[PDB]
Symmetry: C11
Subunit: 67 residues, 11 copies
Amino acid sequence: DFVVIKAVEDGVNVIGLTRGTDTKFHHSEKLDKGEVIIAQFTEHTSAIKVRGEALIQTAYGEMKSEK
Amino acid sequence: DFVVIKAVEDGVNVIGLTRGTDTKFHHSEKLDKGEVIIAQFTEHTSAIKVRGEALIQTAYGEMKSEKK
Amino acid sequence: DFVVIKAVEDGVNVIGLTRGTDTKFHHSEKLDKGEVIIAQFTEHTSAIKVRGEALIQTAYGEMKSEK
Amino acid sequence: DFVVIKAVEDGVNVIGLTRGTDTKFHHSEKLDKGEVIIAQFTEHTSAIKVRGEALIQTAYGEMKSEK
Amino acid sequence: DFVVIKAVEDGVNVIGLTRGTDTKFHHSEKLDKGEVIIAQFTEHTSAIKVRGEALIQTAYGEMKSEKK
Amino acid sequence: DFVVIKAVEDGVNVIGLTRGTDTKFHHSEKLDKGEVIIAQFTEHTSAIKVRGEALIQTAYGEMKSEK
Amino acid sequence: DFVVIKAVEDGVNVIGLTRGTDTKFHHSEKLDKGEVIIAQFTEHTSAIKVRGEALIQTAYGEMKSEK
Amino acid sequence: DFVVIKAVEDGVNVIGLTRGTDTKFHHSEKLDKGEVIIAQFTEHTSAIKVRGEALIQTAYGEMKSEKK
Amino acid sequence: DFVVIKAVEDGVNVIGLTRGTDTKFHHSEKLDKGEVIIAQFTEHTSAIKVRGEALIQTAYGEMKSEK
Amino acid sequence: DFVVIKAVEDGVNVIGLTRGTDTKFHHSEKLDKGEVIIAQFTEHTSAIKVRGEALIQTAYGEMKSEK
Amino acid sequence: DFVVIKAVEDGVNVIGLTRGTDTKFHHSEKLDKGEVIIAQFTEHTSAIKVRGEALIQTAYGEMKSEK
Ligand SMILES: N[C@@H](Cc1c[nH]c2ccccc12)C(=O)O
Ligand SMILES: N[C@@H](Cc1c[nH]c2ccccc12)C(=O)O
Ligand SMILES: N[C@@H](Cc1c[nH]c2ccccc12)C(=O)O
Ligand SMILES: N[C@@H](Cc1c[nH]c2ccccc12)C(=O)O
Ligand SMILES: N[C@@H](Cc1c[nH]c2ccccc12)C(=O)O
Ligand SMILES: N[C@@H](Cc1c[nH]c2ccccc12)C(=O)O
Ligand SMILES: N[C@@H](Cc1c[nH]c2ccccc12)C(=O)O
Ligand SMILES: N[C@@H](Cc1c[nH]c2ccccc12)C(=O)O
Ligand SMILES: N[C@@H](Cc1c[nH]c2ccccc12)C(=O)O
Ligand SMILES: N[C@@H](Cc1c[nH]c2ccccc12)C(=O)O
Ligand SMILES: N[C@@H](Cc1c[nH]c2ccccc12)C(=O)O
């Protein structure tokens, strides 16, 4: 499955956390105002963290992260 | 399957419990106010605990965890 | 599948029962008031018992344990 | 698949019946008033019997056992 | 798949019929008034019969079996 | 998949027809008035015939066989 | 998947046509007035024809064959 | 998957088209007025053609073929 | 999965395009006025083109091609 | 999965992009006004572009490309 | 699974991110005004970024990226 994230303000970060015994950030994707990323869960990513002002859509609804 | 968690106050803990014969915390992710984590159940994680004020969405709807 | 459990009072116990020929508790997770656990059925867990005051959500609706 | 059972009064019994050519009770789980159990069908359990006053939820709706 | 059976009178019988070339009763579970059984179709059971007054729920809705 | 058949009169027959190149009755289950059978299609049964007054429930609705 | 067929009159025929390179009737089930047959598609049957006055239910609704 | 076809007039044909590199008619099933056929897609049939006056039902609704 | 095409006028063509590295017409089925074809995607067909006045039904609704 | 595309004007192109490490046009199908193409994703095509004035249907709803 | 993207202004980019331990842009697809791309998640693409004004449709509904 995947998540849809739209940056509402500049410098939002979409961060992938490692799948496995260890849980660490493997990548932080910077999103500028207005850009959208559609990101899956994958072999390497089993949790996604969102920081900054953004709108998130999933199967379960919408959620806004805040600055 | 996955859970969506938005921190409504600072220092919310998202805790992964170990899959298998033993049940112990293998990781606690700290969220500050306004941050969101989308987390799956996995080979290593078969239970997830939320401590602190947060809005939770799952297949089953919404659940609020309360202020610490 | 999984169950969502929210503790309404302090001292709620979420207990996992062993999958297999034998049925014993293998783990009791204590929840404080306001905490939420999302717990799957697994290789080792085929029944979950809730004791104490709590709100439960499953694929079939909501249920309350009391006291 | 699984069933959710809330005891509405004391000494509700949730009984697992053996999967296979033979059908006997392999376990009877005592449920006190206000407690909840969520139980799966499993390698060892292919029928579940509920005795006592209880609320039961399944994929097919709600049932109340009486007594 | 499974069936939900609630006995509405005493002595309701929930009968499992054998899967395979032969069709015979292999087990009859007796239910007293108010008791509930949730039973699956299995390797050994491919037809289930209810005799006696009962409410049945399946993937298809409700059916009542009548008083014996 | 399965069918739910309730006998509305005495002398209802639920007949299983053989799966394979040949099509023969292999079993006729006689149902008394008010009894209900829930019968699967199986390795040995690929068609089921109902004779006598009965109510049939499937995934597609309800059908009444007539006296 | 399966089809439900109810004979509205005497002399309804439910015919199975062969799966494979060839399309031949392999069996015709006679259905008398009021009788119901519930028949699957199988290894041997990949088309079913109904002749006579009858009511048919499928995944796609109802259809009436005429005498 | 399957399709349900009812003949509204005589001489409706239900035609199976061959699966594979070539596309030919392997068989035409004649349906007389009021008869109904329920026909699957199979190892041999990957398209179905209807000719004559008929009502067709599939997963996506109803379609009428018309003769002449 | 499949498409339903009904010719509303004479000389509609239903064309199968080849699955694989190359994309060419491998077959053009001519449909006269009033005829219907139900056609699958297959090992050999990964795109279907319709030319002429016709009504099309898919899982996603109806579309009309125009002559 | 597949996409349904109807040309509302002359000159619509339906373009397949290559699956794999590289992303290149492997085929451009020209659609004239009123014609429809139903196209799948396949071993060779993992993205499809539509250029010109056309009505598009997917599992997700309707979209209009502009001239 | 796939996403539908329509460019509403000129010079929109649809960017694929690499599946695997590393996260890089492997390709930017230029989408000019009014054009539509329907793009899958694949062996090589596990996240998609949109830069510029566009309408996005997914299994979850609509999202707009901004100018
Ligand atoms: N490394 C962890 C990451 C993770 C997924 N879901 C979680 C929930 C809580 C804590 C960590 C996680 C895992 O793959 O299991
Ligand atoms: N180690 C346990 C964790 C767990 C999941 N669900 C539970 C319910 C109750 C108690 C523990 C659990 C297991 O994998 O089975
Ligand atoms: N040890 C048992 C646990 C169990 C699951 N569901 C039950 C219902 C009733 C009694 C026991 C159970 C086994 O896995 O089956
Ligand atoms: N041992 C039986 C238990 C059972 C399941 N469903 C039933 C219905 C009727 C009677 C017995 C059963 C079995 O595995 O098949
Ligand atoms: N022994 C039979 C039992 C059965 C199942 N469904 C039926 C319907 C009708 C008659 C008998 C049956 C079988 O496995 O097929
Ligand atoms: N022996 C036939 C039984 C059957 C199933 N569906 C049918 C429809 C019509 C006639 C016979 C049948 C078979 O297995 O295919
Ligand atoms: N023997 C044919 C029977 C058939 C199924 N669907 C059809 C549609 C039209 C004509 C014949 C058929 C088959 O297995 O493919
Ligand atoms: N022989 C072709 C038949 C076919 C199926 N669907 C079609 C659509 C158009 C043209 C031909 C076809 C194949 O199996 O692919
Ligand atoms: N030969 C191509 C045909 C095709 C399918 N979908 C398309 C979309 C656009 C262009 C070509 C196609 C393939 O199998 O991939
Ligand atoms: N060659 C790429 C094509 C592609 C699919 N989805 C995309 C999204 C963005 C950019 C490129 C693509 C692949 O198979 O992965
Ligand atoms: N290379 C990463 C790309 C990715 C997918 N989803 C993500 C979410 C956050 C950060 C990176 C990603 C992966 O395959 O796992």
